[PDB]
């Protein structure tokens, strides 16, 4: 609701109190004293405050939804990055001017259809961010059209590797693939390091799938990122690519338990009393 463009439009246009137009039932429960908490809080008002609320209740005042319907649209354009936040007042007066030149019963109905349409489109984008798959599956499958589907040797290792390659981009919503000129790439996160080169890695691994000092370090970076998404039976045991994928799974598991060992040794080296400079260097040389 904090990211809802019509809840945010109600927090910027609608009053923060109980008027007798937007909240007719909640103020008639208070005029007629049938409220659970403090029923007699309306009898204790002056006639200027008490009779002016009765008149707005038995014959309520009409209002314009047009500034509220447009502000729900502007606050969804500013949320789906269609406009800048600095342009939020520029396009608000630009849209209010257009629905004033062309105001009709059709347009006010069409703004009522479009404020339900932008509630969906804000939520559809925020679902697509947390899923994180649609921008990557169409560009990884576009990569794999370029790569051949039949290697000469080790096709069993190759078709499970590229199936685990689809498992990184699916089971990590921040990861993405794209193109920049000839080659394609893979970032493990938005605005993060460890960017592998897919067109350079698969022109390096091609010719190494059945071999059983020769690897480019981005191919080894690819074999490090693909390692937690690869089973022991996904690739072979004797194959040099399969021998490394088991070796990189042990390196991740050792770096996962040297992380917990680091948090234990440095915790009991401060309380026991050591140099804080040398507690942090002798621990790494014990763990690396």
């Amino acid at each position: 609701d904090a990211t809802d463009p019509a809840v945010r439009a109600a927090l910027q246009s609608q009053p923060s109190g109980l008027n007798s137009t937007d909240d007719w039932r909640q103020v008639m429960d208070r005029i007629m004293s049938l409220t659970a908490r403090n029923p007699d809080a309306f009898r204790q008002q002056p006639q200027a405050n008490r009779l002016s609320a009765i008149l707005e209740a038995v014959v309520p005042a009409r209002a314009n939804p047009t500034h509220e319907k447009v502000l729900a649209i502007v606050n969804a354009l500013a949320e789906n990055r269609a406009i800048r936040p600095d342009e939020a007042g520029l396009v608000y007066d630009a849209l209010l001017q257009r629905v004033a030149r062309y105001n009709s019963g059709n347009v006010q109905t069409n703004l009522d259809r479009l404020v339900g349409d932008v509630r969906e489109a804000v939520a559809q984008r925020e679902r697509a961010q947390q899923q994180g798959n649609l921008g990557s599956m169409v560009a990884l499958n576009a990569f794999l059209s370029t790569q051949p589907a039949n290697v000469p040797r080790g096709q069993e290792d190759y078709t499970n590797f590229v199936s685990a390659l689809r498992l990184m981009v699916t089971e990590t919503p921040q990861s993405e693939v794209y193109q920049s000129g000839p080659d394609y790439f893979f970032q493990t996160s938005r605005q993060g390091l460890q960017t592998v080169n897919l067109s350079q890695a698969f022109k390096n691994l091609q010719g190494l799938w059945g071999v059983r000092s020769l690897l480019t370090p981005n191919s080894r970076l690819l074999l490090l990122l693909i390692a937690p998404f690869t089973d022991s039976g996904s690739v072979s045991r004797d194959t040099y690519l399969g021998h490394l994928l088991t070796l990189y799974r042990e390196a991740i598991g050792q770096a996962h338990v040297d992380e917990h060992t680091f948090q234990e040794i440095t915790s009991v080296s401060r309380a026991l009393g050591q140099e804080d400079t040398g507690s942090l260097e002798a621990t790494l040389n014990y763990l690396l």
Binding site: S180, G181, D183, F185
Partner: protein, 46 residues
Amino acid sequence: MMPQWSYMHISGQDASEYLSPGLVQFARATETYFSLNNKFRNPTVA
């Protein structure tokens, strides 16, 4: 061919290839008003 000629771009890859691919897309878009083309050396190899 030689690791010091590939470093100084006497031989090797052209500026579309050894540069960072975002700098190539930056120079391709800002070319008409801020040219980055003559700042980088292309090796021509017979």
